[PDB]
Amino acid sequence: DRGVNTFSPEGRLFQVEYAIEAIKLGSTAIGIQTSEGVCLAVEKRITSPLMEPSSIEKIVEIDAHIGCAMSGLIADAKTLIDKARVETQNHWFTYNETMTVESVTQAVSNLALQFGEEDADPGAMSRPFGVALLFGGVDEKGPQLFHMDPSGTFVQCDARAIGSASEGAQSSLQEVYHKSMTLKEAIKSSLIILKQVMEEKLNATNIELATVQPGQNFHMFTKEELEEVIKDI
Amino acid sequence: SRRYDSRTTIFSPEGRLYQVEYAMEAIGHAGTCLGILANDGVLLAAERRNIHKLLDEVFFSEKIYKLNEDMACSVAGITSDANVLTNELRLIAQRYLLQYQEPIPCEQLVTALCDIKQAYTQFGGKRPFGVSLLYIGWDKHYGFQLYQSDPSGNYGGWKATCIGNNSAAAVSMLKQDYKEGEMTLKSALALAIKVLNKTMDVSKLSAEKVEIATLTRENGKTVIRVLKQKEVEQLIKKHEEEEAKAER
Amino acid sequence: RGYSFSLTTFSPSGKLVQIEYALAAVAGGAPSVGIKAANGVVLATEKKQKSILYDERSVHKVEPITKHIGLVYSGMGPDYRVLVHRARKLAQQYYLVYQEPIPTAQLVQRVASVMQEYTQSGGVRPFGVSLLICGWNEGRPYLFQSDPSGAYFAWKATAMGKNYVNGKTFLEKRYNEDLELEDAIHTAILTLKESFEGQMTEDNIEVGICNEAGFRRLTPTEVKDYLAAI
Amino acid sequence: SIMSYNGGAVMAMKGKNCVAIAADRRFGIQAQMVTTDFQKIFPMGDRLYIGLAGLATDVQTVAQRLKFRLNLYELKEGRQIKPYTLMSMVANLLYEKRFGPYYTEPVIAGLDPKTFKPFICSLDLIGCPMVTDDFVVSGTCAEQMYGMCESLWEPNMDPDHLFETISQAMLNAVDRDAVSGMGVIVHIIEKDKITTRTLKARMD
Amino acid sequence: GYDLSASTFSPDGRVFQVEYAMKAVENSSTAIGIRCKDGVVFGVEKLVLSKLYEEGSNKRLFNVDRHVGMAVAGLLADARSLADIAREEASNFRSNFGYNIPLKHLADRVAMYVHAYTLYSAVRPFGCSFMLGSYSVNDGAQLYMIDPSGVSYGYWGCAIGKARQAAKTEIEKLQMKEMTCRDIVKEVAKIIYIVHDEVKDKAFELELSWVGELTNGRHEIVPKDIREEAEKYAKESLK
Amino acid sequence: NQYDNDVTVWSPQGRIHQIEYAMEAVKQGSATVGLKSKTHAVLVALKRAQSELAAHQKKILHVDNHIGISIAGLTADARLLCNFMRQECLDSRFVFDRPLPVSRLVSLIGSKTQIPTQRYGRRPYGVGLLIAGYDDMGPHIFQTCPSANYFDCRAMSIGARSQSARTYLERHMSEFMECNLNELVKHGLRALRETLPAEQDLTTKNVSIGIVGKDLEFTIYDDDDVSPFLEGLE
Amino acid sequence: SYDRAITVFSPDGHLFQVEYAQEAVKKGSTAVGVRGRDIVVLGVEKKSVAKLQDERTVRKICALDDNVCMAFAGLTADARIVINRARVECQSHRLTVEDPVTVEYITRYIASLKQRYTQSNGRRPFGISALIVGFDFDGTPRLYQTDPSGTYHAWKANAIGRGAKSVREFLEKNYTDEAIETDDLTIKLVIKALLEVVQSGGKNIELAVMRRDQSLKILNPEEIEKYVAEIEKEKEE
Amino acid sequence: SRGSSAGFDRHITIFSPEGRLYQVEYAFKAINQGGLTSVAVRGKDCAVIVTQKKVPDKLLDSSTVTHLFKITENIGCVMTGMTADSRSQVQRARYEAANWKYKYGYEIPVDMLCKRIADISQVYTQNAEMRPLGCCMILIGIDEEQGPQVYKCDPAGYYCGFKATAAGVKQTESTSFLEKKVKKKFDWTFEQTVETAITCLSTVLSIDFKPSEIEVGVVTVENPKFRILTEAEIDAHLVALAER
Ligand SMILES: [Cl-]
Ligand SMILES: [Cl-]
Ligand SMILES: [Cl-]
Ligand SMILES: [Cl-]
Ligand SMILES: [Cl-]
Ligand SMILES: [Cl-]
Ligand SMILES: [Cl-]
Ligand SMILES: [Cl-]
Ligand SMILES: [Cl-]
Ligand SMILES: [Cl-]
Ligand SMILES: [Cl-]
Ligand SMILES: [Cl-]
Ligand SMILES: [Cl-]
Ligand SMILES: [Cl-]
Ligand SMILES: [Cl-]
Ligand SMILES: [Cl-]
Ligand SMILES: [Cl-]
Ligand SMILES: [K+]
Ligand SMILES: [Mg+2]
Ligand SMILES: [Mg+2]
């Protein structure tokens, strides 16, 4: 036993490495960025028929132009999601403009290494966040997808998977993605890929899907809109 | 410093809190202390550990503490820890009285102390208090009451109980003799002596070795008294006369 | 900063071993005795006084807290000085509020409470001393012991430090309720002679007394006088 | 004046082996009477009372905060508080607020719980104590009160004579004061009993 | 083990963490100071670990007040932090008392700061030793040296780092009490060249500074032309 | 071993293993190069891309009109330090109405980054920086380390396989002072290219460039903007 | 003040304190919740029995507000802290919104409290799970569950505590539109679910109901053993 | 018991199973690391401190090598043990004395200054996070009623006034020598106080000093200000001794 801010001989923070491993215990989520908008899709991972599926929320609205998909230790994600929400509203308040997807992601990622047990306030963070996040949205740069992990590293991706089957899903993504792909194509592709990787049979209640498009605000797919897409797949 | 921190406020692998358990072992070795609820009152009876010949006898008891007008307690475990907690009980009871201008209801005082005990098991890195308490009282909501708390910050109400040395045996004898809804202070007193007589099996029971307090109501006022040695010997006498009847 | 965790904790068997171990430092300390007579209290202690080079008068083990209360100890001297200082401060705090000297028992309770803190509070060990505290108030003598746990006890007579078990049985077979203070001083000094080693002089024991007139150390010359008989 | 916002009067008086404490009963706000049974004298022991005149809110706060402290004292200490000690406790409570004081000037009356010796005192609003062997007065008619006490009080009075003297001192004093009265209550404290009386008094 | 914290004595009464910090100074290349008739001269064997570095990079000689130089060995980040402490102490002294801090007092103050890092598990000892030099008409030339334990002494000559002993033995040959700063700089350079191990560590820069009558009591770098002449004298003297 | 978990624990050889371990975070970063002429200071960085569909991590950051950085190691520590530098620069323009001299800013980095190496429960910064700047003393390249040491450089490379880049830079460094800007950036690119596996090449997707000098505020070139510099590596 | 990091990651992404907190919950008395059509029911085992106990003083079902209650399993002292914190929060909500909390709002608050005690220095996690029930302003009935991690979900029915696995299995098979058509059957479903695991059935099931607008009613032993006989004589047939 | 150990009782100041404080014991060993011995003696007219002065290195400015320190005008001290610790303790003593005079309007008594430093040292024996100071302080001054004073305090926080005492490597042997000499003397009191101190030191070290190898500090009833003897002054004592 050693402190939470101890480096390994390889130059990595043990706690951060260990937090990255917790992401592998999450359900799979996928993001794809097209010139017509971004989609976010996530495996719900229902553990009992008695559980209400709509109470699993692994895709959330950050603001009208920005959604977020999470995988890993979901309870940890709450303060991150709330920070993103507060930050975009502060930016609107101060600057009367929407905050960029990149900027939001940056703000949240600045929390990542703020843990430790003798710099900080009487009960500050004791450990990093066991969560990875995909921020998908539209700003003046156009549609955009960004990934962030517990190291606070963040980067734009054209398509990305996270969670348990991300290897796998990321391969199928390299295979199907192309820069001129339509949003409808990307939606089909991410449901086809979820369908491969999911232990359970895919259906309209054990996945979620959302989009954001230059036209149109953050939109969570209804049961009925999922059922329509699921027919081809 | 992480090397020296014995980590008093963490879970063990089975979801246990070792300090709390260990503190409970300290209590089980302390002086036996019982509480018995009756229709007309409530009592505490405790084994004295302050029994050497050269001791001086200066307070009105060893382990019975007045908390406010309507309540008292006894304790089993680390004495100095008990002094901290009983001081805190008195403070809580005056805070209430200041604020509401009525006596703190019994269960509310117990729960307030128990929340302090609980905190000590959850944060702050300190050893818990090594004290279990029995609380006797009257309030206008539930009348005569008896409560028990332990170092986990857990508590419960009882019609009769025991903490400290030979607790398990004492509770068995209570289970068997206690008449729910039909006890008087006089018969609770007899029973208390019967129980201590069995559970102080090191050795032959004597007034110098026990302390008894009663809590009754007289003319709309709570009366809390520690029995004098004359009365304690009389009850011991009566119990010894009673066991002479036991066969024929 | 300060360590914020307790250094005293429960062992599996329910023991606070740091407090036991503090009691072992007390037991290895120099002997102290207190006897409560009918009309007063005597405190007496052996000086662990090596060398003729020591100026015996330069530090005292028997100390005044107030005009009417005094203390002695067995165990670690420097720990005792802490408690003497706090006891004095406690007594004055009481006097400022109530305008009456602190009753002996109240003083013992507040000092004992400090000792309890050092068994739980963060980054500290318990005090390695036991105190004998004498006083006179409500027209009557008091003798108390306060131990490293913060437990206290009222005694008619007792002994602490090296060879205390024997000292206690020596006093059992010697104290009576109706004993006078001057006789009590004699029996206190005899109790020290039971475990002395070295030949007693007025310079290697220290004696304090407490009665209606107040608490004071006996002077070397007064001790010399009691020593002629012994 | 803050001290006259509510009006009111208290006094205490020593007799042989007994003491007396009295108060008017009006609670009013400037000219307006609100009630006529407002308590100003509070038990602090079986044979020890405290009377408070001044701003009604502080009368109640001081009585309550004092009781808090006293109850803790008595639980910790063996025993019932001595009169002189109560005075000191009250002094210390009032002087903590030296720079934002409670607007009350108490009188204390009692018998020592062991010796039954009579004690009376008063304090100013920042806790300066004053013990006397005759009487003390506090309130919006203190001059009137002094004039009655100086003229009527004698030493070594029996309980009946003490009751008449303190009663006549209060009634006649408050009847020269617009904002005190609406009734008088008197407690006579003796070794073996407390006698509590309300007086026939002007109600204007 | 007894060697993990500066708040733990070993059974023989040592504080190994302070000893380990001293080992860091002892691994460093050598710095020397010499007090003479009219001032103090400092020299450092400044190992050049890459040819990619600028001349002057990683200076080991600092101005801590206008009259006070500091020469360091050991972990350089710790030394720089100490130079900041020294600077702040000299600045605060001037603000409070209204005159230039006397060398000895400055040495004693910074030494107590170093000392404070030798008592606690909360912090570690500084991995550096350093010399302070000054000159004034009133106080003369003064040279002090402070080590990781916080001990502070004054010297005629001093050396710190890995060839300390070899340096001292060369310094002992000078009658420095009767020499001037201008004569001593050459001898400083000479001694750095003597103790330098040209086989084991390949490239060094000589760093030189001084404070004395000739600089009017200001601590200054030795001018370039005088340093080069001193190097040339040291190099030829090695022959 | 008992000596490697706390930045406050000296080893018996006079080393601090936590600081050495922090330096490994920089050695494992992607390589970056910094070099200068008489008139300009240039940074060149290789961007590592997580997947084939990821953008490539930012390596080069704006600090002030006259200062930019290249990073290697923990990106979150890089941002924390970069934000410190930014703030120090703003403070100086607010107070003095002039740019913060580059060597002073680097001093402030040394002092700031040393502090946690000496306190229990803190850790070093796990990042190394190359700092390009231009002030009254001309162009600069500085290097900062997790040890809190820093260096003033003719040129430098840190990160994975940077030894190769350092060798190239030593080989050609006598040419740098007199180089025009195109020449100097070409040199930076050739040095960076030595760090690559022999198959692979510099592309507009993997190279980022930062330039400041006498005529030119700190400017970042990415993606299509690096092509002019990449063509005529002739 | 004590700032030790208590909950930390281990290799493979475990949070051992949290896993140990979950072990505490698994040794608690079984608790079961079912969401009816227009009723919600909570039932809980035992815990000790003991004739000399004052039963009123150890209930494991607790009102949070007029329209929300909860049961818990695990460390009972920890539960009391969570319950009091939630009770305070229900009064802030009413203060600042002038509506009662939704069940989801207070659940989300409790879960977030629990999550914070897994990521703050100087503290261990709460060793409890809770089943939180009531109705929303618009009449919709609700059952949520929280655990030591701070995770929460809504359920049709669920069990926590010792024997949760088998009680949950039983509910999965027995929760149908038919079993919850009425009030009595909803209640009888909860009792059947307990009566599977409950040592000396039963005897020591404590049970409570909440109707739309009607506030928490706890059943008494007389009303409980009515349902017990009414289910046991049906299982002979 | 007999040297037993549990848990961390050799690393921090917690009790061992016999009730010892090993860390405190180890601080006493640290006092000897320095290799030096100090002696202090008091008579009716004066008090004296003598210590070894070892200047192994020629390159030291020997005027800066001392273990004698002025605390106030009227209080002097000799420090034995770890040097930087000693200096810290000297600073604290200077602060305590100055503070006392500012608050109380008269000079701190030597006994009170010694008690204060010892009380501060006590805290290091009870709190776990810092070590004791591995040094020992001997104070001299004139008290207006009691005459010349010698006081000593140690890393356990013990303190005492003395007729004579010693510290460091040869403390035990010094103590033996001084005891043997006072018993001989009428009313158990030293009269030739500077000679006793130097003689004690010379015997227990077997050296026969040069005047540059010891330092001597004094306070006298006629001249209470603490004074450090010059080399020539010390030489006069060395020569007066050598000639009988
Ligand atoms: Cl992943
Ligand atoms: Cl009360
Ligand atoms: Cl009450
Ligand atoms: Cl801590
Ligand atoms: Cl004191
Ligand atoms: Cl007093
Ligand atoms: Cl005295
Ligand atoms: Cl108050
Ligand atoms: Cl060195
Ligand atoms: Cl990198
Ligand atoms: Cl990173
Ligand atoms: Cl470095
Ligand atoms: Cl590198
Ligand atoms: Cl909270
Ligand atoms: Cl469960
Ligand atoms: Cl002054
Ligand atoms: Cl002599
Ligand atoms: K210590
Ligand atoms: Mg009137
Ligand atoms: Mg009228």
Swiss-Prot record, chain A:
- Identify the tissues in which this protein is expressed: Expressed in fetal brain (at protein level).
Entries under InterPro entries matching the protein: Ntn_hydrolases_N, Proteasome_alpha, Proteasome_alpha-type, Proteasome_alpha_type_5, Proteasome_asu_N, Proteasome_sua/b
Q: Where does this protein reside within or beyond the cell?
A: Cytoplasm; Nucleus
Record-level GO BP terms: proteasome-mediated ubiquitin-dependent protein catabolic process
Tell me where on the tree of life, at the top rank, the source sits: Eukaryota
Positions of post-translational Phosphoserine modification: S8, S48, S55
Explain what induces or represses this protein's expression. Up-regulated in colon cancer cell lines. Up-regulated in fetal Down syndrome (DS) brain (at protein level). May be the target of the transcriptional activator NFE2L2.
Read off the Gene3D superfamilies from this record.
Glutamine Phosphoribosylpyrophosphate, subunit 1, domain 1
Q: Which GO terms describe its cellular component?
A: cytoplasm; cytosol; extracellular exosome; extracellular region; ficolin-1-rich granule lumen; nucleoplasm; nucleus; proteasome complex
Record flagged with keyword Nucleus: yes
Q: Which UniProt keywords apply?
A: Acetylation, Cytoplasm, Glycoprotein, Nucleus, Phosphoprotein, Proteasome
Q: In the record, which positions carry Phosphothreonine?
A: T47
Q: How does it assemble?
A: The 26S proteasome consists of a 20S proteasome core and two 19S regulatory subunits. The 20S proteasome core is a barrel-shaped complex made of 28 subunits that are arranged in four stacked rings. The two outer rings are each formed by seven alpha subunits, and the two inner rings are formed by seven beta subunits. The proteolytic activity is exerted by three beta-subunits PSMB5, PSMB6 and PSMB7. PSMA5 interacts directly with the PSMG1-PSMG2 heterodimer which promotes 20S proteasome assembly.
Report the family membership.
Belongs to the peptidase T1A family.
Q: Which gene encodes it?
A: PSMA5
Swiss-Prot record, chain F:
Query: What cellular component terms from Gene Ontology apply here?
Result: centrosome; cytoplasm; cytosol; extracellular exosome; nucleoplasm; nucleus; proteasome complex; proteasome core complex
List the subcellular locations.
Cytoplasm; Nucleus
Q: Name one GO biological process term.
A: immune system process
Pfam (any one): Proteasome_A_N
Reported induction: Induced in breast cancer tissue (at protein level). Up-regulated in liver tumor tissues.
UniProtKB keywords: Acetylation, Cytoplasm, Glycoprotein, Immunity, Isopeptide bond, Nucleus, Phosphoprotein, Proteasome, Ubl conjugation
Question: Which residues does the record list as Phosphoserine (modified residue)?
Answer: S107, S174
InterPro entries from the entry? Ntn_hydrolases_N (IPR029055), Proteasome_alpha (IPR050115), Proteasome_alpha-type (IPR023332), Proteasome_alpha1 (IPR035144), Proteasome_asu_N (IPR000426), Proteasome_sua/b (IPR001353)
Domain of life of the source? Eukaryota
Q: Which residues are glycosylated?
A: S107
Instruction: Tell me where the cross-link Glycyl lysine isopeptide (Lys-Gly) (interchain with G-Cter in ubiquitin) is found.
Output: K112, K205
- Tell me, what is one Gene Ontology molecular-function annotation carried by this entry? lipopolysaccharide binding
**What is the annotated role of this protein in its UniProt record?**
Component of the 20S core proteasome complex involved in the proteolytic degradation of most intracellular proteins. This complex plays numerous essential roles within the cell by associating with different regulatory particles. Associated with two 19S regulatory particles, forms the 26S proteasome and thus participates in the ATP-dependent degradation of ubiquitinated proteins.
Family the entry assigns: Belongs to the peptidase T1A family.
Name-wise, this protein is Proteasome subunit alpha type-1
Give the organism, scientific name: Homo sapiens
Taxonomic lineage of this organism?
Eukaryota, Metazoa, Chordata, Craniata, Vertebrata
Instruction: Name the encoding gene, please.
Output: PSMA1
Curated annotation (Swiss-Prot), chain G:
Q: How is it modified after translation?
A: Phosphorylation by ABL1 or ABL2 leads to an inhibition of proteasomal activity and cell cycle transition blocks.
Its biological purpose: Component of the 20S core proteasome complex involved in the proteolytic degradation of most intracellular proteins. This complex plays numerous essential roles within the cell by associating with different regulatory particles. Associated with two 19S regulatory particles, forms the 26S proteasome and thus participates in the ATP-dependent degradation of ubiquitinated proteins.
Write down the Gene3D superfamilies for this protein, in alphabetical order. Glutamine Phosphoribosylpyrophosphate, subunit 1, domain 1
Subunit-level organization? The 26S proteasome consists of a 20S proteasome core and two 19S regulatory subunits. The 20S proteasome core is a barrel-shaped complex made of 28 subunits that are arranged in four stacked rings. The two outer rings are each formed by seven alpha subunits, and the two inner rings are formed by seven beta subunits. The proteolytic activity is exerted by three beta-subunits PSMB5, PSMB6 and PSMB7. PSMA7 interacts directly with the PSMG1-PSMG2 heterodimer which promotes 20S proteasome assembly. Interacts with HIF1A. Interacts with RAB7A. Interacts with PRKN. Interacts with ABL1 and ABL2.
Question: Which protein family is it in?
Answer: Belongs to the peptidase T1A family.
Q: Which CDD domains match?
A: proteasome_alpha_type_7 (cd03755)
User: Where does the source fall among the domains of life?
Assistant: Eukaryota
The species this protein belongs to is Homo sapiens (Human)
Q: Point out residues bearing the modification Phosphotyrosine.
A: Y152
Q: Which residues carry this modification: N6-acetyllysine?
A: K226
From Swiss-Prot, chain H:
Indicate where the modification N6-acetyllysine is found in the sequence: K101, K103
- Point out residues bearing the modification Phosphoserine: S16, S62, S63
Key words, A-Z: Acetylation, Cytoplasm, Glycoprotein, Nucleus, Phosphoprotein, Proteasome
Asked if the Swiss-Prot or TrEMBL record annotates the protein with the keyword Phosphoprotein, the reply is: yes
SUPFAM superfamilies with a match to the protein in the record: N-terminal nucleophile aminohydrolases (Ntn hydrolases) (SSF56235)
Instruction: Enumerate the subcellular locations listed in this protein's record, separating them with semicolons.
Output: Cytoplasm; Nucleus
> What are its GO cellular component terms?
cilium; cytoplasm; cytosol; extracellular exosome; mitochondrion; myofibril; nuclear matrix; nucleoplasm
Q: Report whether Transport shows up as a keyword of the record.
A: no
Q: Which GO terms describe its biological process?
A: positive regulation of canonical NF-kappaB signal transduction; proteasome-mediated ubiquitin-dependent protein catabolic process; proteolysis involved in protein catabolic process; regulation of inflammatory response
Q: Give the sites modified to Phosphotyrosine.
A: Y158
InterPro entries reported in the protein's UniProt record: Ntn_hydrolases_N, Proteasome_alpha, Proteasome_alpha-type, Proteasome_asu_N, Proteasome_sua/b, Proteasome_subunit_alpha6
PANTHER family, alphabetized: PROTEASOME SUBUNIT ALPHA/BETA
What protein family is recorded? Answer: Belongs to the peptidase T1A family.
Q: What does this protein do?
A: Component of the 20S core proteasome complex involved in the proteolytic degradation of most intracellular proteins. This complex plays numerous essential roles within the cell by associating with different regulatory particles. Associated with two 19S regulatory particles, forms the 26S proteasome and thus participates in the ATP-dependent degradation of ubiquitinated proteins.
What protein name is recorded for this chain? Proteasome subunit alpha type-6
Q: Which organism is it from?
A: Homo sapiens (Human)
What gene does the UniProt entry assign to this protein?
Answer: PSMA6
